[PDB]
Amino acid sequence: KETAAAKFERQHMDSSTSAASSSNYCNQMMKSRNLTKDRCKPVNTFVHESLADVQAVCSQKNVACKNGQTNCYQSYSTMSITDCRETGSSKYPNCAYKTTQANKHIIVACEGNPYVPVHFDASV
Numbered sequence: 001k002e003t004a005a006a007k008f009e010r011q012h013m014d015s016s017t018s019a020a021s022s023s024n025y026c027n028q029m030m031k032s033r034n035l036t037k038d039r040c041k042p043v044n045t046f047v048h049e050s051l052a053d054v055q056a057v058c059s060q061k062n063v064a065c066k067n068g069q070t071n072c073y074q075s076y077s078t079m080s081i082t083d084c085r086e087t088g089s090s091k092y093p094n095c096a097y098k099t100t101q102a103n104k105h106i107i108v109a110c111e112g113n114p115y116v117p118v119h120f121d122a123s124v
Contacts (some may be wrong), residue, residue, distance in 0.1 A: 003031075004057075004111065004112070004118040005112065005116045005117070005118060007093065007118075008034055008108075008116075008117050008118050008119065008120070009051070010034070011033060011035060011039060011044060011120070012044070012047055012053065012116045012117075013046070013047055013048060013051065014029065014046040014047065014048050014059040014082070015047070015049065015050055015051065016047060017048055018048055018080055019048060019080050019082075020046070020082035020099055020101050020103050021069055022099070023098075023099055025082060025084075025099045025101070026044075026082065026084030026097030026098070027095070027096060027097050027099075029046060029082075029084065030044060030084055030095060034070060036093065036095040039088075039092055040086050040090055040092045040095035040102070042085070042086040043051050043075070043083070043084065043085050043086070043121050044084045044120075045081055045082065045083050045084070045106075045123060046081060046082045046084070047080070047081050047084070047106060047120075048079070048080040048081065049079045049080060050090065053079070054079075054106070054113070054117060055110070055116055057073050057074070057075045057106060057108055057110075057114075057117065058073050058108070058110035058115050058116060058117060059073070059115075060064055060073050060074060060075055060076050061073060061074040061075075061108060064114055065107075065109050065119075065121050066121055066122065069109065070078050071108065071109050071110055071111060072108065072109050072110075073108055073109075073110055074105050074106070074107045074124065075105045075106045075107075076105075077105070078103040078105055079103065079104070079105070079106050080101075080102065080103055080122055081101075081102055081103070081104060081106065082099060082101050082102075083099075083100040083102065083123070084097040084098075084099060084100075085097060085098050085100070100124070104123040104124060105124050106122075106123050107118070107120075107121040107122040107123065107124065108120055108121060109121055
């Protein structure tokens, strides 16, 4: 078990550095956070801001989700993030990822009471 909000936290929050420094980060983080246990999750984004800062995005700019639902929200401010994208040479279980740091606006789907992030939709 694990709640949807917890799993979002496990899969998408990394408040601990300001910016994934160097090239090792995704290889290490996708593993530490269990995103490579069944298969190599092929794309995953970590957000380097506070929990309250990301939770606040659920009251920010409402936008359509990529799947067509209406419960997505874009941050007004840019945020520090790290895209992890699986390489072409990556063979499970030794999953390999290119680490890309950026500052972009995030788009999260939010649900529940309390109304909190449960998916990472996109960055823009």
